[PDB]
Amino acid sequence: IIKIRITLTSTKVKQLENVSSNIVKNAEQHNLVKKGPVRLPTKVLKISTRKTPNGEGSKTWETYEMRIHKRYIDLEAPVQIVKRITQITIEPGVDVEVVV
Template identity: 60%
Template structure:
């Protein structure tokens, strides 16, 4: 029988079995349960996923139509990458006014000119890794100022 071992020779002697009989049938059994419980498989390291940050994109422009177009482009790109988005939040328009005299010298009729510049702002909040945000903001039209702040 192939499972019979001679206990007389030290090379085949099992440390757990000490019987006076020279020929003993040895049955292979599982190791003790305590040894299995302490063993944990090492976790496979697939590389860390990029950490998502709270990112706020502030867009400002003097021209509303270009600003709205850029906002919709950024939101569409973010939705295509399955990111959590809040916005666009429309902030109150800043109106900058300068009133000056029309004439360069002090003579003549006292006529005044009033110049006005309106600055429109939009906020977009994202939860995304910084690399993804760089890809989203790559191509933006001229005339729109972009400010990116990372919270955490």
Template identity: 40%
Template sequence: MSMIRIKMWGTDLDTLNHFTNSILKIIEQLGIEKRGPVTLPTKIIRIPSMRTLGKRGTKIYETYQMKIYRRFIDVANDERFFKSYFINMQIPSRGFRISLKILK
């Protein structure tokens, strides 16, 4: 049976965990085969910027960073899950992305 990989990533860890737990709850209610959730390494994006010139012309830098948290779940390709729940699911709009991929 083919599997579908649900890959999620976002900047807010609480939102990502809440969304992952809601998917897992529905999968357990329907009794669908699953693998995961698998936690991928956190991606950290760092942006250095020059704040000001200090005394005697020395450069002072500040570093801003953004963390991107990632998870994926492999779910058996079952129509009940996608028709009943996944189409009507409310996905958080800000700082959250989701993708689906069919695995053979």
């Protein structure tokens, strides 16, 4: 068996939690032991800019936000099954990085 850590990162909370639950269920039906999915704090990439494309008007500012939500699940499994777990994660929008 091989102990690994799968990191899931995306801005779509529903789509990210979908894989964060699919991985857990796919390791439960295979009956592994895992340290439960840890939820690292969401990074708000807030960026403040001036509404006016020029220098006229009331000084009105507007901030955009990009919420990056990250999660990490660490478990152990042999190669044949860990590759299946890393191939089930094809959710559009969520990037998945496996580290041994």
